[PDB]
Symmetry: C4
Subunit: 104 residues, 4 copies
């Protein structure tokens, strides 16, 4: 049990340690900006309550997927399609970073 | 084919070997803890039967996604959002771990 | 355009070449067995037409997710939860293989 | 912060650099071709407007998942199933590619 905690502590440090990487920071800021753009878009174009626009934005950008909603307008559909690829682009970026920070 | 069977057994042994690595154990415990928390939260805050709270927690944390449910309360929606990133954080941890052992 | 085709051809060979790896073969067979078990389970326990049981099995094991269905019985729910982790276990296996076959 | 901006620009350049690699171009073309095929198929076989066929094709091939649609015909269901594995095959290709450049 003491090993668990010491490993947990080491791992948690490593995580916070990665929060120092400028590229990880960019990816993160880029992700927040994307989630905000999405929240603004869906509430405006699809007329969703801000909290619902962020929710759809989140489950969409992470590939989780929404269980009861899909854009009703053609503008929203087109946007969601491009939105998804930005999300995949961001995920690839994070993964590439990992792959790089593991091989040095 | 003994060959297929031997290759499988070799793979299963490599898998059990993983369940011995401390960092994997932490990640595993953390996800179980995260699933339990989710079950508790959705049962209480969204009024779901525990079994359905576990289900939603699972399909959500894994990015599988729910086919019919979506949080009705604002607290639930905000929790689900942070819950998803915890899941992503956990997945990256397992991935990083698999990229570490591959050396 | 000729480069495209020659690269496409080289890549396609590499893919088929990977179909020779015994571990990839096991993962694959393991995946087919899992999809068949799932198809059998959902058609039996949830009463879904075989083709619908395979569909739900597929979108569930790949994390795609079903847009209009979720198990109705507690037995189905429990099964789906374990089913998902088997799927993640298989994906990790494939990924681990990649990571290994790239570093040699 | 010039620093943030410089780091970003550096990353964007690395991304554009990728769009120059032939294997990436093949994978990219293949996915676009796969998306077009999907749009065509679902419009024709499931009677969806092209825009909705593209949407379903996209959320399906990316594992995002559709919130309200699911194929009504057997041909559609079988196609979706193979479509998903094409998507997984493509993702593994991009992943393998990103694990190759990381050396
Ligand atoms: Ca999904
Ligand atoms: Ca739905
Ligand atoms: Na997913």
């Amino acid at each position: 049990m003491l090993s668990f905690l010491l490993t947990l502590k080491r791992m948690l440090r490593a995580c916070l340690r990665a929060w120092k990487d400028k590229e990880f920071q960019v990816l993160f800021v880029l992700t927040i900006l994307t989630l905000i753009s999405g929240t603004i878009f869906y509430s405006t174009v699809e007329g969703l309550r801000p909290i619902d626009a962020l929710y759809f934005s989140v489950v969409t950008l992470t590939t989780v997927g929404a269980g009861n909603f899909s854009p009703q307008t053609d503008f929203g559909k087109i946007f969601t399609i491009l939105y998804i690829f930005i999300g995949i682009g961001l995920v690839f970026g994070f993964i590439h970073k990992l792959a790089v920070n593991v091989q040095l």
